[PDB]
C-alpha cells in the first residue's frame, strides 16, 4: 500500500498515451480529419500550463505500415474491431476544447513506435535524418 | 565546379528550414494562427510523397524563451524588424495547398533548437521526458 500513482491521475487530466476523441474538424484542404480519436503524443507540461495539445490522427485502415510514418495498433487492446493505423505525418495541435473524451490507451511498445516514427515523419531523428 | 547541390533545390520545392507563409487559418478554438510565416520542420520524404507538411507557428513577440517550447530567432537573418519566436507547442500540419511562398530561412544552430525544443515540447525526448 504505497501510492506511487493515485486512483485517478498524476494531476494532468490528459495523460500521454490516453486517447481522446477530438474535433479535429475544420481541417484545411487536404488535412485529414473530422471528429475522430487522436493519440496524445504531447509532453507533460503542456497538459499543465498550455491550452494546446499536440496529437496525431488515428485512422481505421489506410495502407500497411510500410512507411516509417504509418504505425499500426492492436485492435485487441486499442478496443476497435479492426487494427488501426496512426498517421505520424497527419498530425496537429488542438487545444483542450477540441478533446472530448478519453477512449483508448496505448502500450509502451507502441509509445516507441509513436515517438520514434514521429521523428522520422518529422525529420528530427537524433542521428540526423540524412544519416540512416 | 562540382554540383553537390544544384541551382534551385534538391528536387523538393519545400526545403527544411525554408520558411513559408501559410494559411494556417480556420484554426480551431484556441489554436494560434491565421496567415503567418511557418517553419518547415518536416522530414525529407513528406515533401516528395505526402501532400501534408508539418510546420510550427512563428510569432513576432509573445514571451521570452524561458520555456523549452519557445525559441527565438535573430531578426537580422530571419529578415524581420524584430526577433521573432517560434512556438514548438503551437504547431500543426498543413498540406502544400496551405503553403504560400518562401520567405525566410533558418540557421543550423536554430535547427537544433527547433528539432530539439520540439521534442521537449512534444515529450519524445530520446533520453525519455521523465529523465532530465
The sign of the CA dihedral B10, B15, B18, B24 is positive
The total of other beta-carbon atoms located within 10 Å of residue A34's CB is: 12
CB contact under 8 A, B46 and A69: yes
Radius of gyration of chain B (CA): 15
In angstroms, the CA B123 to CA B120 distance is 5
Q: What span, in angstroms and rounded, lies between the C-alpha atoms of A94 and A36?
A: 13
Decide: helix, strand or coil at residue B71.
Answer: strand
> Quick one: closest CA in B to A25, which residue?
B28
Of A46, A56, A104, A50, the residue nearest A80 (C-alpha): A104
Split into its structural domains, chain A has a count of 1
The range of the structural domain enclosing residue A67 comes to 1-132
- Please report, for the domain that includes residue A81, its CATH number: 2.30.30.110
Which method, experimentally, gave rise to this model? NMR
> Residues A108, B130: contact at Cβ < 8 Å?
no
User: Beta-carbon neighbour count of residue B21 at 10 Å?
Assistant: 17
C-alpha cell at A86: 496512426
Residues of chain B whose beta carbon is less than 8 angstroms from a beta carbon of chain A are 16, 23, 25-26, 28-32, 41-46, 50-52, 54, 69, 89-98, 115-116, 118-124, 126, 129-130
* Cell, residue B3: 554540383
d(CA A92, CA A89): 9
Cα-Cα-Cα-Cα dihedral of B4, B9, B11, B17, to 10°?
A: 110
Q: Do B31 and A123 touch (CB under 8 A)?
A: no
Contact between A88 and A118 (Cβ < 8 Å) = yes
CB of B31 within 8 A of CB of B55?
A: no
Instruction: Give the count of beta carbons closer than 10 Å to the beta carbon of residue A18.
Output: 17
Q: How many CA atoms lie within 13 A of A132 on its CB side?
A: 10
Amino acid at each position: 500500500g504505497s501510492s506511487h500513482h493515485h486512483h485517478h491521475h498524476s494531476q494532468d487530466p490528459i495523460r500521454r498515451g490516453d486517447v481522446y476523441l477530438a474535433d479535429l474538424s475544420p481541417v484545411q484542404g487536404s488535412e485529414q480529419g473530422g471528429v475522430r480519436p487522436v493519440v496524445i503524443i504531447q509532453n507533460d507540461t503542456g497538459n499543465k500550463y498550455s491550452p494546446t495539445v499536440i496529437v496525431a490522427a488515428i485512422t481505421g485502415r489506410i495502407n500497411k505500415a510500410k512507411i516509417p510514418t504509418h504505425v499500426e495498433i492492436e485492435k485487441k487492446k486499442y478496443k476497435l474491431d479492426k487494427d488501426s493505423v496512426i498517421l505520424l505525418e497527419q498530425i496537429r495541435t488542438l487545444d483542450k476544447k477540441r478533446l472530448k473524451e478519453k477512449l483508448t490507451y496505448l502500450s509502451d511498445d507502441k509509445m516507441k513506435e509513436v515517438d520514434n516514427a514521429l521523428m522520422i515523419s518529422l525529420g528530427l531523428n537524433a542521428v540526423a535524418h540524412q544519416k540512416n
